[PDB]
Amino acid sequence: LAVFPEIFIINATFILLIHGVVFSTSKKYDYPPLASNVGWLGLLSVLITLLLLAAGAPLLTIAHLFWNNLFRRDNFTYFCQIFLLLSTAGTISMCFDFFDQERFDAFEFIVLILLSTCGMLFMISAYDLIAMYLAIELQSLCFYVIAASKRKSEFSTEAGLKYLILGAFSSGILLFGCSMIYGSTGATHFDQLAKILTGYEITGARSSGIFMGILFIAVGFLFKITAVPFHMWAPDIYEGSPTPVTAFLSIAPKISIFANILRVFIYGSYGATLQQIFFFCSIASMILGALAAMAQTKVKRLLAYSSIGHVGYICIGFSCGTIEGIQSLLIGIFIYALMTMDAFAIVLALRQTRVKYIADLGALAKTNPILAITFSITMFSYAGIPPLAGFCSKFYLFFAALGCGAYFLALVGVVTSVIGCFYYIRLVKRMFFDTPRTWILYEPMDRNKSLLLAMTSFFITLFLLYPSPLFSVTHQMALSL
Amino acid sequence: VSEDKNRNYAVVAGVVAIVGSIGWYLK
Amino acid sequence: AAAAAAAAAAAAAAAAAAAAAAAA
Amino acid sequence: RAFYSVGFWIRETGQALDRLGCRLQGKNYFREQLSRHRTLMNVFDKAPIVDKEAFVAPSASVIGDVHIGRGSSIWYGCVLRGDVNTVSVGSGTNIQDNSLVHVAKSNLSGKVHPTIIGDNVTIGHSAVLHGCTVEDETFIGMGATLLDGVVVEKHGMVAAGALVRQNTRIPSGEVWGGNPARFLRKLTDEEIAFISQSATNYSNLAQAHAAENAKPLNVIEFEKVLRK
Amino acid sequence: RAFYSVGFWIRETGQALDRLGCRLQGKNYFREQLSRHRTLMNVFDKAPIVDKEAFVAPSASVIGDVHIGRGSSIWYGCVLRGDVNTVSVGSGTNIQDNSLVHVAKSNLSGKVHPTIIGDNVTIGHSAVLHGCTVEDETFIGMGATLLDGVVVEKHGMVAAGALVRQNTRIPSGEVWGGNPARFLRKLTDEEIAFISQSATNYSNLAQAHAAENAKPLNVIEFEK
Amino acid sequence: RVKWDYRGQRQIIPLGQWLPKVAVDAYVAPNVVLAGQVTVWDGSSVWNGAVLRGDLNKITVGFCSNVQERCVVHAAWSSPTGLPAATIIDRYVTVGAYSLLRSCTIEPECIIGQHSILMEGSLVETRSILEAGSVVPPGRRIPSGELWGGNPARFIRTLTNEETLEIPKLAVAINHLSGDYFSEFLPYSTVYLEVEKFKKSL
Amino acid sequence: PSLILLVAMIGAIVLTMHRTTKVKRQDVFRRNAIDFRRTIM
Amino acid sequence: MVGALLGLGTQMYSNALRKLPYMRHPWEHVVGMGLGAVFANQLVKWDVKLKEDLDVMLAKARA
Ligand SMILES: [Zn+2]
């Protein structure tokens, strides 16, 4: 046993896939638009998976056969795997409206999202290089298809091709690293790998073959999370695709990759090389994002760059070896995810507006004044303004970084937060104080999208009154590795 | 004196799902 | 292509003469 | 089981009644959204013989003695109280919104003069034809107030908001206007061309307001407008 | 009012238990777009009061604080919309048609005052009386219009299309019939007889019109 | 044709893909008659009896732009002479009591006073107050900030900027009143209950 | 890899069906009641 | 509990984007959120129990 939570989502995907194709290819049902019927059913398939994974959390480690030769499930994986499904479900909740407006007959598009979640669930628990690569391939492959869903419009398909090549290269680079890592280790399991690589220290103890592999595996992961050293065309992918598909790739693959990153590198590899590369990436991502937030104008692209800047703050936790720092990274991932879902949902709130600049998004003070305050909260959360939940996560990242001793890295993060805040007050000024740009009038959304904002915006502000639970949850996960 | 065939099954299912929710706390 | 495919199903073979078998 | 859930219909009434137990802080909600409005005919002692093709708007309380011709409209919210003196409407006379085609009892000297409006008489919005006869193929102005015994001759448009005093029957083609009864000008022939054009277009436009008389099934079937 | 708001919530709370609670049983009856102007005497914390012998037409709304007395009438299409201050319509008046009597709310630019309509006042059609302390046995003309604070004194026969100006205390018996308010002529006595007899004319014509019924055959037709 | 339809009069009358969509927070008084293409916008207020019809062009009242009691707002067919004449009563315009409009394109922050008849192409410019009975002929562009009036639309006065600053306050005061009314109506109606009790009497 | 071959099948189908089957060969789709039918051009 | 108070606020200001006014029948779902607060606090006692164990399990594994 022990694979039942993953088995259910794979079975649920197959059952939805058979239901969608048989029904969609039905003259009797007049070839109906299954998407949105596959939806709701798809959202509850994730929710049933969430319950099964949570229910069997003590039972997850049922047998040595699964952990030693296939995948190992641990307390850290369970807490993040629960979050991964919740992140996936939250994205589906905002996405349902997009399915309704679009002529979505793509029942398969939901099955791809569930298949991606199954790949992501296998990715979090993957304990072998073969398993991690195969799981990464499935999650990315499902994602490649979602990017090219709007075939009639070349803008989505061309964006998909750049995402596909970046994905193929990232998987391929990681694969080459596995080959080199395999050559020295003689085994592909992370557990066997850790025994050979424990305290390898490429300066203290010679390890030419292992390092050659480690260099490739680390580089491949960075392309997947849109790290700035390998950001490449990844920011382009975010703006070119419509906002809802962009949201799904924005949070769920990134969270899965970050959780996979901590497991593959901290436990398996012990050299003074892995922490430093993230430290350089963190400084660069925040610097690139801060420059980009001022440089970028389109609201969708700006969100991607703000997300890239936040990704750098997340990277610092791995960069500082302290377990408290790894915990701080987890606090950041959760806050960034809630804000990223909230931010995409506010953009999704202005569904009526076609692609438009920030100035057009302004003038929301007179109309939808509460939404205007809600937009201000979303920008503030990435900005690092103190009352919001993001600052508390950043302060833990910074407090851990000061304890870790990363004064230079910590300072640039504060400086990048400072660089971001000026644009955010300017954006807040744009919303109410100035640049209304025509007094444009917006349209309503579904209750689920409003609740995504309601359950998140209140929580972002409520974090100050009761911040203890999240901090407790995050450290437990870091210690488990 | 009834609604469309199948709507009744869903209405019955909702009560059995809601009964389960109270029951889950109870048992 | 939405062109009408040649469905190879039909009614079973029953030799259909004209009504003038016996008495015109 | 379903359909016996009418208990929720009965439960709603308890709360639909809890408005009484909650209208105590001041005398509140004397309105109940009732049903009766003796409006679309409201026959006092004479009945309108309005045609089967003369679209009257369900707001238009065409009281008492009225007659409308084939193709003429009686638009939204226009009372026609033919209660004390006879009224009539020729084929094509589009008595537009908010009209007051209610006639008279008298005004200071007899002057019964049953209002008779000819064909193709495009009457304007908010017009008040209190007690004048109107001739064929003229275009009264939106906001006009046509007082007692003002025979508006043919093809003579009355201006927008143009109050016309008593007995000041305008000539043909003489565009009237002004708060006092004064003429304005003799515009052009294109004026009468557009008068006839607007008259026939308003006739077929009222023939396009057949959705006003649609049935519940047809209203909810139009609610398919979302899909298209 | 606070408890009025709570009442709106329980009625809404109840209305939902019927809207899809028991209507979902195959019933789209609540989905029909029936009119709501038939709330002739629309209400607030202040309510419209109307006596027995006062015909109100069903095509006409009477919103806000209203005090329709005896004999007064509100004919087809009129709107006595007087939320701010009471529309203290006196006795035996005769609005006669699509008129309007407003204390309609502005930003207190002129301190909107109640509209104390007098007695036997046979207001004509389309009159747009607006903050009008119009006194008794007065005539207002067809298509007319008035302005804030006006006091149309006794027997002041405002003419058709007229537009009386702000705060103008028109003298008792002076005929003002122009867009810039302007006295024209001391009214004659035959006009006095006409205005004092048209009062009871409509008083009887309004006690007539006998709406007070239902037309099921037409209801059965419009049902199909 | 039969008279006395139980339905009363549906206040939102679409025809041929043309739904006069009412934005929420727009108190559309129950007497009104929306038809064809009438896009009332946020915070607007269509008051008692005010008809708003629909032609080839489209009526549109703007943010906070009320159309007060008994005000007809129609639009001419195309009027392609100078500009497409689709009535656009833009933001904060207070179209006062018992006025009348047709194909005129009013500009932000006006006050179209009582009984003020209009006509085509009368682009009443921004921040413009019109006196009572403001009748306008086609094409008379009342300029900015200028009080007007008169039966042929004769100019009267330019306005001090304090009155211009007060116009938005009057628009939002009307909107406050509109919200006070919108709190008097519920999403659906209770008329159906009375109609069913009528039908069960049959 | 079984699931990866299945995802490759689903992908080659959803990508390169090219509107040549029920993806768009359902019908052109038309509704009469909403249709103007010469009332509106 | 405080969570029920939270689920009233979250139900309001929600659909405010839709400008829907005040609250409706599904809006009064603060009993469900009240349950969330009770579980969140309960999870923390278990999480803190486990968090102490995670430090002690680390020490037992460390030896
Ligand atoms: Zn009269």
Domain limits, chain E: 49-212
Find how far residue A432's CA is from the centre of its chain: 31
How far CA F198 is from CA of E28, E219, F55, in Å, comes to 16, 10, 37
Residues contacting B3, CB < 8 A, separation 6+: D2, D3, E24, E25, E26
User: Chains with 3 or more CB pairs closer than 8 angstroms to G?
Assistant: A, D, F
Torsion of CA D102, D103, D108, D110, to 10 degrees: -160
User: Is E6 touching H (CB cutoff 8 A)?
Assistant: no
Torsion E160-E166-E172-E175 (CA) sign: negative
Contact, D57 vs D212, CB < 8 A?
Answer: yes
| Residues of F whose CB is below 8 A from G40 | 16-17
User: Is F98 touching D (CB cutoff 8 A)?
Assistant: yes
Nearest to E190 by CA among E200, E182, E198, E181: E198
What SS3 state is found at A33?
A: coil
Residue indicated by tokens 């959705």 = D211
Residues contacting A461, CB < 8 A, separation 6+: A377, A387, A388, A389
CA A246, CA A243: separation in Å to the nearest integer?
A: 5
Contact, A252 vs A195, CB < 8 A?
Answer: no
- Rg over alpha carbons for chain C, rounded to the nearest Å, is 17
Q: How many domains does chain A have?
A: 1
User: Chains with 3 or more CB pairs closer than 8 angstroms to D?
Assistant: B, E, F, G
CA H54, CA A408: separation in Å to the nearest integer?
A: 31
CA A340, CA A418: separation in Å to the nearest integer?
A: 20
Residue indicated by tokens 């709106």 = E8
Nearest to D2 by CA among B9, A422, G23, A121: B9
Return the number of other C-beta atoms located less than 10 Å from residue F64's C-beta: 27
Assign residue F13 a region: left if phi > 0, alpha if psi is -120 to 50, beta otherwise?
Answer: beta
Q: What are all long-range contacts of D139-143, with beta carbons under 8 Å and residues at least 24 apart?
A: D139/D195, D139/D198, D139/D199, D141/D177, D142/D96, D142/F72, D142/F74, D142/F100, D142/F102, D142/F117, D142/F119, D143/E143, D143/F100, D143/F115, D143/F117, D143/F135
User: Chains with 3 or more CB pairs closer than 8 angstroms to E?
Assistant: B, D, F, H
| Residues of A whose CB is below 8 A from F42 | 367, 441
Structural domain for A25, as ranges: 1-481
What SS3 state is found at E100?
A: strand
Angle of helix A243-261 relative to helix A208-224, nearest 10 degrees, comes to 160
Q: How far apart are the CA of A409 and the nearest CA of chain F, in angstroms?
A: 48
Resolution in Å equals 3.8
- The partner residues of A210 in beta bridges, in order of sequence, read none
Return the number of other C-beta atoms located less than 10 Å from residue A189's C-beta: 20
CA D102, CA D85: separation in Å to the nearest integer?
A: 9
Question: How buried is D174 (Cβ within 10 angstroms: 0-12 exposed, 13-18 middle, 19+ buried)?
Answer: middle
| Residues of H whose CB is below 8 A from F24 | 18-21
D102 Cα to the center of ligand 1, angstroms: 6
Find how far residue E13's CA is from the centre of its chain: 33
Residues contacting H61, CB < 8 A, separation 6+: none
CA F139, CA F88: separation in Å to the nearest integer?
A: 15
Cross-chain Cβ contact D126/F137 below 8 Å = no
The DSSP element (H or E) to which A331 belongs, if any, is helix A323-349
State the pairing for strand pair E64-68/E82-87. Answer: parallel
User: Is E30 touching D (CB cutoff 8 A)?
Assistant: no
Contact, A288 vs A229, CB < 8 A?
Answer: no
CA A354, CA A423: separation in Å to the nearest integer?
A: 23
Assign residue A440 a region: left if phi > 0, alpha if psi is -120 to 50, beta otherwise?
Answer: beta
Half-sphere exposure of A134 (CA within 13 A, CB side): 16
Torsion of CA D135, D137, D141, D147, to 10 degrees: 0
Phi first, then psi: give them for residue A227, nearest 5 degrees. Answer: -65, 145
Torsion D11-D13-D15-D21 (CA) sign: negative
Chains A and E touch (3+ CB pairs under 8 A): no
CA E154, CA D199: separation in Å to the nearest integer?
A: 44
Partner residue facing D211 (CB), from F14, F49, F193? F14
CATH 2.160.10.10 applies to domain D62-213: yes
The DSSP symbol for A267 reads I
Residue indicated by tokens 């007959």 = A105
Contact, D106 vs D60, CB < 8 A?
Answer: no
A449 Cα to the center of ligand 1, angstroms: 56
CA A50, CA A87: separation in Å to the nearest integer?
A: 11
Nearest to D102 by CA among D93, D120, D117, D115: D115
Partner residue facing D221 (CB), from G33, G35, G39? G33
User: Is B21 touching D (CB cutoff 8 A)?
Assistant: no
Contact, F71 vs F99, CB < 8 A?
Answer: yes
Cross-chain Cβ contact F183/H21 below 8 Å = yes
- The partner residues of F12 in beta bridges, in order of sequence, read F34
The DSSP element (H or E) to which A469 belongs, if any, is helix A468-480
Contact, A358 vs A418, CB < 8 A?
Answer: no
State the structure-solving technique: cryo-EM
Residues contacting D136, CB < 8 A, separation 6+: D90, D118, D119, D120, D121, D154
CA E150, CA E166: separation in Å to the nearest integer?
A: 6
- Which of 28-47 (H) contact E at CB < 8 A? 28
D122 Cα to the center of ligand 1, angstroms: 22
Q: How far apart are the CA of D222 and the nearest CA of chain G, in angstroms?
A: 7
- The partner residues of F40 in beta bridges, in order of sequence, read F22, F61
- Burial string for H4-14 (b: 16+ CB within 10 Å, else e) reads bebbeebbebb
